[PDB]
Specification:
Chains A, B: Homodimer. Homotetramer; to form the enzymatically active phosphorylase A. The structure is a homodimer of 810-residue chains. Chain A is of the alpha/beta class and 810 residues long. Chain A is built from 33 helices and 25 strands. Chain A has 2 domains: 483 residues, Glycogen Phosphorylase B (Rossmann fold), CATH 3.40.50; 327 residues, Rossmann fold (3-Layer(aba) Sandwich), CATH 3.40.50. In chain A, strands 1, 4, 7, 8, 11, 12, 13, 14, 18 and 19 form a 10-stranded mixed beta sheet that branches. A 6-stranded parallel beta sheet of chain A has the order 22-21-20-23-24-25, sandwiched between helices. The longest helix of chain A has 30 residues. The structure holds N-(carboxycarbonyl)-beta-D-glucopyranosylamine (2 copies) and pyridoxal-5'-phosphate (2 copies).
Chain lengths: 810, 810
């Protein structure tokens, strides 16, 4: 139908149909009379999958022959989403499959909606890993994503009585056609035990063993015939395990629980033993695999030349002492040599500065679970501090501040300090975040080793976040500048010469309108809920957290409602405010915020006087697949975290690439986005990081804002009196109390400027032509935010490898 | 190579090779450079599997169109063994696959050894179900095997220090290419809850729900293009289950444990709650499936005309009250009508008379787990006893003897009584067993309803137990009488006219010698253990149990050893005594018997004076696949259970069909086997059932035999003094104490006649020609023991359906 979806050749379409019927028959064991839409989805998935295998096998054979430096991206999260459409896009099979299924009397879009999201992530951090895998494959890097194959990913969110309810994400229920179990490469992982010091070296003995079974999933590059691998480990109990008989067999569950479920926390550290087991499990199995592959290429001096390990935050930080353990205890290398290798091999990426998110494991936990690693960590700390003492003689406080071991109630190991000490590179994920790291939390480390600190601003893949979710926009763009931008997003700047092009302006606006109509329809289809497609789509989708300030958005919504009620017959730009996102199960305040949003909707959406001028909808079960639907339909992107809290943000980039304007604070990547597009094409408001610090030095007193702002006072009084919760008048007391007495994120401080800024947004929306022209200026300068650019920087500046856009023979 | 393995056509072999390479590439994602023997096995399994699907789909479509009466065989055990070779045999693809793999440079036999046994059974009972499925498909019956898909089947047995060690049978580790998950047909199963009595009818509410997910495995008939289904249920927790968050997800294990492991008991009842859950789980899911299928064909009067449910022992006995529950509580039929339907639909097969094997569930268990079913059982009992009271007025003891409810310490429900009351047919599995049922344990029931009692002598499938495991024998037989006997075993009688044929005599003996050489080689390959192929192969393989009397065999072995030591230079027919079988993990005496056997081997196998004249080997991990190897190599079959204890036995039939002579008691099917072949061609010895009863009335005193038999006394003294356990002199005290003071199976009573009979066996073995002629007389009359004959009788006399040997168009 459209050009960027490839050719629908005669032979290819015929071949696809035959293979589709072949799988339906031989693979699913069904015939057209009893086949269901799900059967058809699988028939198509297997058919598309077949096209991947050939490239997958030769890509891997290729790396074996050429033996390039391997990149290992370790993460406990890979937020992949669906795989069918992404695979067709990267293999240029979309139109062909669309035609083939059409001729078979099937609607491919309907079939795509059947696939379960691979939700092995919580949010930004896990999605980043997914975008990175796509970019690494597209840039021809010999990269491997290593993680855990959770039986249950992020929970499915149900809203009941306005409250969030969690239910198990049994994503493997119907099977996963994309993965390939590789039981032949199963590896043992050790836990507990004790350390024995013999004549030559220490030995970790009397351990409990859990097997790590790998499952491989193909990661196709964009039209370059490269197919990399994402290897996820699954926990398996050994067969002699616990070997009454029946109970012993049933207790195998204990060991296999390690890969059972993803911890649902976003930017929050929960020091549970099970989580520590998952972290070591992925690290231990992965490192053995890495070393095995290295040996089949004794000379560990060249290890750093053939291996790069990227730690996605501190979750896989045990890779440092585990690598030391293997080199020292098993390979028998001297400490200093092993340490040299480890440092040159490992690199660490920090994704947050919030104190509650930093991993600080109790020593008693490591002591019992990983006795040898604790000893290695102490030795690392001893040697590191000796270096600090030599560089800053007499500075005893620096010593205690930089120690990997924190003293106090219970001794803990600061995993971030461990990562900096054992990595040759440490990076932040946005310019402002990386600067904050050097000026605050990692200042001491930066002064000791300035060369280690870098910045690698985040990005998103333009394949999934443009071509796949917004084909209409990708098409009108391709019509003017070709398709080269899909793997070279910087080319979007050429669109600047069309900012005054009446035809283009009209097409950009038309695509957005179509996306909104499609989404407005979807809302009634799967959720029965009416909305006005002509209104401004104001959306804030991301995990629910106090720092992201969904509450500030709520205050604005209530302000709009109160203004309408005050002057009913006054004209106001119609808005549909959409807020979505999951709250961690144990995060009470976050759950209360969700309830508040639905409560506001209950009042606003049924007030006759408001009419279709204002609607407040809470988007249930926000996930990757839902993001692909709502982002292309958005007009306004809410990125309003308190300055200095959102390390980077990536949703912000997705909105910018898809034609939405941004209202936000100078936080994370928002700063660079505004810099790229020009501040006059961005809706910036609120305190800058410096203003927040000034307020903290002086002391934040929310009461002051409450006393000086009548509209704000009115909102708080409405919340307190039960205006939004008639049957339960004090339902939101916790929220009001927090806002008034212990709001770490200064919601009130940015309220006035936020509301004012929102007024300017509505003013511009009233002028369709100028709004669209500003949109074009944003889309045109979003090129820097492609993860291809991010990965190219990691490749050259950290891993020491050159990216390549060379096609492999298919 | 040989004729009964089909044709190796040019086009077919070429097609097989291509498809083999296709699966290796697309399905396993490997190429000839990294493929392992296991990869090749799977490539072949998928290739053969492809040939099944077409027939599987049309067979099922066929039953839908013609709508014949459906046969549902409910069993908690299906001891299937391997599936690859069996599938090739039934599809006439063996030679073609042999050639195709040959041309690909692969040894098919080597690949077949890679497949894991589907050990979802303990022994005879589970294997019978497997043979039955094969026969039902071969006879064109619309039959379905329904059971549980245990994650872990019968444990793998390891022998350490002469002791049995158990290890989990993780048979699904590498995947199962034969099954097809059918998540779309998942059904809910209820547990616990309580009963509510409303205006119209009772309601079972507040129940805990477990989902039953079916996995279908194809069951091919022998060359008739019929492919039936074996549907096994897997337990799955609902997603709202238990819905801290993490713990709730982990606790899903509780519900899914239902299908985790097979209880490893043979002829022994263990009243554990988990076992009861498994029993109801299979019954509840199966009945819903049955009714669903029936409705898609309101008129339950015709239910018995379209449905037959066969209960494999009492394990699935809850089908009776469950069917009543559904008809009365859900369909709203009046009791009497529902009962009429239930009785005409259900039939029960008893497999044992041992008291410790009978299922007697504590009322408190049913009360808590299945409250509605207990009420239904009480009502059934009330009405049944009213019938008994009317037929035998004033006979109050009969009432208490026949009650489904047993009074005493704890009230229990006699499931066997429940089955007889709710079934229109009750059968034993061998003529003598069925007679014992009418004369003893079920005498009262037989007097009340004589018409219900029948006999259906067991059988074994000649496909797996002849053509598959002994192609050499199948070939020489086919050479003389054709291939028709494979699905009409009675034709083997034609071999009687070859009993004097010198050529045939020579071939029969040659095949046996080849099988022995092959097995003798296997023993050194996988177990490193030397044996003499020229010796008489004396084997007893079956589950270890006191009633099977492996101990009597041990006494004979020790007797042989003592006789040799007494007169070293006297000639004796060389023997290799092989004993194998698993012991239930909690069956202490059985485990002690295994230790005794290995202990005897330790002494006998290393005594220089004995030389290669006597060897005692314990066959480790006896399973279906091992049975296929050792049975064709056997000369003497040990079937020595105490008269009246082995209901039928089936291993006995396998040995007879494969050219081994039988030494045994007049127990189970041994009686009919001797009757068929002629007593002069069988080695019968010991007490008959009547002799056992006489001994019991008089009182069994083992001391008497010990005092009158010097050789026996010597053996007991050797055991007691530590002759077979130097380091642990009293190691076998429990065994001696049991034999001397509480031997329920009168081992000593049959010792003298057994040893005497064994002497006649050795005498005949010394005359190769006459031994073989007797073998021919056995093989020639083994036709009655084909499970095709057994199933044909079940079909006509119980299910009311006619078997058919008509091919379906392929
Ligand atoms: O640490 C977390 O839980 C987490 O999701 N951190 C997230 O990582 C993303 C990728 O770098 C950043 O863009 C987000 O600003 C940060 O909060
Ligand atoms: O009940 C058991 O555990 C069991 O295996 N019973 C077995 O069933 C077989 C099939 O009918 C019979 O041939 C055996 O004699 C009987 O012990
Ligand atoms: C991109 C994405 C995120 C991250 O969004 P931010 O607004 O940067 O926090 C979270 N969840 C999903 C499903 C995403 O697609
Ligand atoms: C046939 C068979 C049995 C039953 O043997 P019996 O001697 O009748 O008890 C038990 N186990 C296996 C593996 C079998 O093949």
């Amino acid at each position: 139908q459209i050009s960027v979806r490839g050719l629908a050749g005669v032979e290819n379409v015929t071949e696809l149909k035959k293979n589709f019927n072949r799988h339906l028959h031989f693979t699913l064991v069904k015939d057209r009379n009893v086949a269901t839409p799900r059967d058809y989805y699988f028939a198509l998935a297997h058919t598309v999958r077949d096209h991947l295998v050939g490239r997958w096998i030769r890509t891997q054979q290729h790396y074996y022959e050429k033996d390039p430096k391997r990149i290992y991206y370790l993460s406990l999260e890979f937020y992949m989403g669906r795989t069918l459409q992404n695979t067709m896009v990267n293999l240029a099979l979309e139109n062909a499959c669309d035609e083939a299924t059409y001729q078979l009397g099937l609607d491919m879009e309907e079939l795509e909606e059947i696939e379960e999201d691979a939700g092995l992530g919580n949010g930004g951090l896990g999605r980043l890993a997914a975008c990175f895998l796509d970019s690494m494959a597209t840039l021809g890097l010999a990269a491997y994503g290593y993680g855990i194959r959770y039986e249950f990913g992020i929970f499915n969110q149900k809203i009941c009585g306005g409250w969030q309810m969690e239910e198990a994400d049994d994503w493997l229920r119907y099977g996963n056609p994309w993965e390939k179990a590789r039981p032949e490469f199963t590896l043992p992982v050790h836990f507990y035990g004790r350390v024995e010091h013999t004549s030559q070296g220490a030995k970790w003995v009397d351990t409990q063993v859990v097997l790590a079974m790998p499952y491989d999933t193909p990661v196709p590059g964009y039209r370059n015939n490269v197919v990399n691998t994402m290897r996820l480990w699954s926990a398996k109990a050994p067969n002699d395990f616990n070997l009454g008989y029946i109970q012993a067999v049933l207790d195998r569950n204990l060991a296999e629980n390690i890969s059972r479920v993803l911890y649902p926390n976003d930017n929050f550290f929960e020091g549970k033993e099970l989580r520590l087991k998952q972290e070591y499990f992925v690290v231990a199995a992965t490192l053995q695999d890495i070393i095995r592959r290295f040996k089949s290429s004794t000379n560990f001096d060249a290890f750093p030349d053939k291996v790069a390990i990227q730690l996605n935050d501190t979750h896989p930080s045990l890779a440092i002492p585990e690598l030391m353990r293997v080199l020292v205890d098993l390979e028998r290398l001297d400490w200093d040599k092993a340490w040299e290798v480890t440092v040159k091999t490992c690199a660490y990426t920090n994704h947050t500065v919030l104190p509650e998110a930093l991993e600080r494991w109790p020593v008693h936990l490591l002591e019992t679970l990983l006795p040898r690693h604790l000893q290695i960590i102490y030795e690392i700390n001893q040697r590191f501090l000796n270096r600090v003492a030599a560089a800053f003689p007499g500075d005893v406080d620096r010593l205690r501040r930089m120690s990997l071991v924190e003293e106090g109630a219970v001794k803990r190991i600061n995993m971030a300090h461990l990562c900096i000490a054992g990595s040759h590179a440490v990076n932040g994920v946005a310019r402002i975040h990386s600067e904050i790291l050097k000026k605050t939390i990692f200042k001491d480390f930066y002064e000791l080793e300035p060369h280690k600190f870098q910045n690698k601003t985040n990005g998103i893949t333009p394949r999934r976040w443009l071509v796949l979710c917004n084909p209409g926009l990708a098409e009108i763009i391709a019509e003017r500048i070709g398709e080269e931008y899909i793997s070279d997003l910087d080319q979007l700047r050429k669109l600047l010469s069309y900012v005054d092009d009446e035809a283009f302006i009209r097409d950009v606006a038309k695509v957005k309108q179509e996306n909104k109509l499609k989404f407005a329809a979807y809302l009634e289809r799967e959720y029965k809920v009416h909305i006005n497609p002509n209104s401004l789509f104001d959306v804030q989708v991301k995990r629910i957290h106090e720092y992201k300030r969904q509450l500030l958005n709520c205050l604005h919504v209530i302000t709009l409602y109160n203004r309408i009620k005050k002057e009913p017959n006054k004209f106001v730009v119609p808005r549909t405010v959409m807020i979505g996102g999951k709250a961690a199960p144990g995060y009470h305040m976050a759950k209360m915020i969700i309830k508040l949003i639905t409560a506001i909707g209950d009042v606003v959406n049924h007030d006759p006087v408001v009419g279709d001028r204002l609607r407040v909808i809470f988007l249930e079960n926000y996930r990757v697949s839902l993001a692909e639907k709502v982002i292309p339909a958005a007009d306004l992107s809410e990125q309003i975290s308190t300055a200095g809290t959102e390390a980077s943000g990536t949703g912000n980039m997705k909105f910018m690439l898809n034609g939405a304007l941004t209202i936000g604070t100078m936080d994370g990547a928002n700063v660079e986005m505004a810099e790229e597009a020009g501040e006059e094409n961005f809706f910036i408001f609120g305190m800058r990081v410096e203003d927040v610090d000034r307020l903290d030095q002086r002391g934040y007193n929310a009461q002051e804002y409450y006393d000086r702002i009548p509209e704000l006072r009115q909102i708080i009084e409405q919340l307190s009196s039960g205006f939004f919760s008639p049957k339960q008048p004090d339902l939101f007391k916790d929220i009001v109390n927090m806002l008034m007495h212990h709001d770490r994120f200064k919601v009130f401080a940015d309220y006035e400027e936020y509301v004012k800024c929102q007024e300017r947004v509505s003013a511009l929306y009233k002028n369709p032509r100028e709004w669209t022209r500003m949109v074009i200026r944003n889309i045109a300068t979003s090129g820097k935010f492609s993860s291809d650019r991010t990965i190219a920087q990691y490749a050259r500046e950290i891993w020491g490898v050159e990216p390549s856009r060379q096609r492999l023979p298919a």
